[PDB]
Design an enzyme around this catalytic site. Structure first.
Site, short mmCIF file in Angstrom:
data_model
loop_
_atom_site.label_atom_id
_atom_site.label_comp_id
_atom_site.label_asym_id
_atom_site.label_seq_id
_atom_site.Cartn_x
_atom_site.Cartn_y
_atom_site.Cartn_z
N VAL A 34 1.30 -1.48 -0.42
CA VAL A 34 -0.08 0.38 0.43
C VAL A 34 0.62 1.31 -0.25
O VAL A 34 1.66 1.32 0.71
CB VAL A 34 -0.73 0.07 1.44
CG1 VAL A 34 -1.87 1.60 1.56
CG2 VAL A 34 -1.30 -0.86 1.14
N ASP A 156 -10.37 -5.07 4.92
CA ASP A 156 -10.27 -6.37 4.03
C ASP A 156 -9.09 -7.14 4.92
O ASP A 156 -8.87 -8.30 5.82
CB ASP A 156 -9.89 -6.35 2.57
CG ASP A 156 -9.17 -5.73 2.00
OD1 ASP A 156 -8.82 -6.08 0.85
OD2 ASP A 156 -8.82 -5.04 2.69
#
Ligand SMILES: Nc1c(C(=O)c2cccc(OC[C@@H](O)CO)c2)cnn1-c1ccc(F)cc1
EC number: 2.7.11.24
Length: 330
Positions: A34, A156
């Protein structure tokens, strides 16, 4: 179609649309990396997960499809949702990379009012998820991204220390009885208790020790629960162990808000038919200051028929491209 730019940050290569500037690498994972990023279109800070190795195997292919399908479907204040999905590939043939763009949060997982707000939001988020027959299944502090409004969103997947097993419902870790959505509630329980005391509640060093630590607190399965254990292997295991009484949770969570402790007794039961549901948990007196039933919405129905499919890398790969192509931002 926008124009892209290339970039090597942390030995990994990044191909994003110009609309995403100042990529700051801020966390890594099994299924991807990320970056933080400023979105020139909305003027917001955002996160960008580049899935690592999205279409390497049938397992990776499916997983990638699964991730995209779920984020595309999550639309809720307390659940992380897809702001944008994209790929540098101009056709399915070249299609080799999947980037997921969502909100930039802040951090991970204090006063009883804090626990209340935080747990409220998790459970408001599990009501929803659970309503679409989805089970997070690995709920833990590092899938709980809070910002400075104290505003929660369920991720998630987390980032990378905390062992998953520290937070797993026995049933789904010792594979010992029919499990349902309320595996997440055991976790919320384990999370809630951590916020209250400061200490991991069940800091086990493996599966056998974990079960030892859970039983210390909750007591060995009685004749009514032993009754529902389907494994020859685990019944044996449990009944052989030295029997432990159930603890008074007020004696373990001393000085904690007696309502907080009541919610804990209600979440940390071994019998997954007795365990309190998300939807039930919100109506608990503990959340009086936040509970609002006309604002704990459920979710659109979610088609997980794909889970039961054995497909070929290329097929999954194509369905995913389909979902990239078929996206609409909110
Ligand atoms: N949105 C986030 C975060 C965060 O926003 C996050 C989480 C924890 C800490 C954190 O740090 C923020 C600051 O330190 C950096 O600005 C961000 C972490 N992973 N994801 C995510 C991104 C894309 C997906 F498809 C799925 C999940």
């Amino acid at each position: 179609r926008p124009t892209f730019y290339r970039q090597e940050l942390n030995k990994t290569i990044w191909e994003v649309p110009e609309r995403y500037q100042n990529l700051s690498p801020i966390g890594s994972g099994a299924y991807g990396s990320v970056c933080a990023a400023f979105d020139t279109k909305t003027g917001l800070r955002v996160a960008v997960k580049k899935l690592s190795r999205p279409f390497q195997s049938i397992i990776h292919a499916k997983r990638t499809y699964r991730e995209l399908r779920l984020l595309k479907h999550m639309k809720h204040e307390n659940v992380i949702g897809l702001l944008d999905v994209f790929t540098p590939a101009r056709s399915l043939e070249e299609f080799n990379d999947v980037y997921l763009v969502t909100h930039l949060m802040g951090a991970d997982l204090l006063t009883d009012d804090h626990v209340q707000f935080l747990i409220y939001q998790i459970l408001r988020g599990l009501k929803y998820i659970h309503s679409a027959d989805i089970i997070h299944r690995d709920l833990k502090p590092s899938n709980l991204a809070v910002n400075e409004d104290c505003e929660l969103k369920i991720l998630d997947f987390g980032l990378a220390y905390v062992a998953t097993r520290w937070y797993r419902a026995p049933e789904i870790m010792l594979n010992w009885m029919h499990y349902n959505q309320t595996v997440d509630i055991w976790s919320v329980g384990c999370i809630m208790a951590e916020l209250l005391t400061g200490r991991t509640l069940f800091p086990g060093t493996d599966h056998i020790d974990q079960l030892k630590l859970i039983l210390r607190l909750v007591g060995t399965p009685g004749a009514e629960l032993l009754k529902k254990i389907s494994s020859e292997s685990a019944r044996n295991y449990i009944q052989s162990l030295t029997q432990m009484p159930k603890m008074n949770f007020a004696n373990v969570f001393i000085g904690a808000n007696p309502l907080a402790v009541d919610l804990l007794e209600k979440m940390l039961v071994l019998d997954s038919d007795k365990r309190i549901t998300a939807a039930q948990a919100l109506a608990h007196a503990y959340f009086a200051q936040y509970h609002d039933p006309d604002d704990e919405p459920v979710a659109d129905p979610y088609d997980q028929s794909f889970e039961s499919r054995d497909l070929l890398i290329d097929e999954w790969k194509s369905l995913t491209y389909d979902e990239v192509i078929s996206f609409v931002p909110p």
